[PDB]
Design a binder for this molecule. Structure first.
Ligand SMILES: *CC(=O)NC1(c2ccc3c(c2)OCCO3)CCCC1
Length: 185
């Protein structure tokens, strides 16, 4: 199946807990895969302007680990629930991808999760100004604009254009390569 295939691909890139104990300022993000109209999509947020970290940016759901979190995956899930209403039972965490080192003292750990088809986003306006989907295939042939490289994605449902950049754009490309490379049509 499309989903069994995607999960099988993703598991080959799982680093698991290999980097999880290192003494960093720790953040997790959830890369949420959603199947619609027979294709995979990634779910993104636009962060509220009110935030301290990345205000107004296109980001995956996520945030800073807190003492309650059993592990780095729990961080991702807690933060996704708080931001977009995603409950734990609505997500299957498939793997942990390469972590992203920033600012010399920070480690961001990305988790890919498959999202239940009955999930409907409920954007929390204190955290998120918008929640949107991009087809995963877009990241193989993106519309690039140079400021460094920025992707522009125009939702054909409404004509709205989103700018995706930095680590968020880099992860979206990685996931697209992992899942979509070398497939029969
Ligand atoms: C867009 C994005 O990834 N936002 C998050 C983020 C985490 C950590 C840092 C930054 C953004 O910005 C600068 C360095 O630290 C928000 C919370 C999870 C990811």
């Amino acid at each position: 199946s499309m989903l069994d295939d995607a999960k099988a691909r993703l598991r080959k890139y799982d680093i698991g807990g290999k980097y999880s104990h290192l003494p960093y300022n720790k953040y997790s993000v959830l890369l949420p895969l959603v199947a619609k109209e027979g294709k995979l999509h990634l779910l993104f947020t636009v962060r509220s302007e009110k935030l301290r970290r990345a205000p107004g940016e296109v980001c995956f759901p996520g945030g800073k680990r807190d003492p309650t979190d059993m592990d780095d995956a729990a961080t991702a899930l807690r933060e996704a629930q708080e931001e977009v209403g995603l409950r734990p039972h609505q997500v299957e965490v498939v793997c942990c991808l390469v972590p992203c080192l920033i600012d010399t003292d920070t480690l961001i750990t990305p988790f890919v999760g498959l999202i239940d088809h009955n999930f409907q986003a409920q954007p929390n306006p204190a955290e998120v100004k918008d929640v949107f989907l991009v087809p995963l295939a877009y990241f193989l042939h993106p519309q690039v604009h140079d400021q460094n490289h920025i992707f522009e994605y125009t939702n054909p449902e409404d004509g709205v254009t989103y700018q995706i950049k930095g680590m968020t754009a880099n992860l979206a490309v990685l996931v697209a390569f992992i899942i979509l490379e070398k497939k029969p049509t």
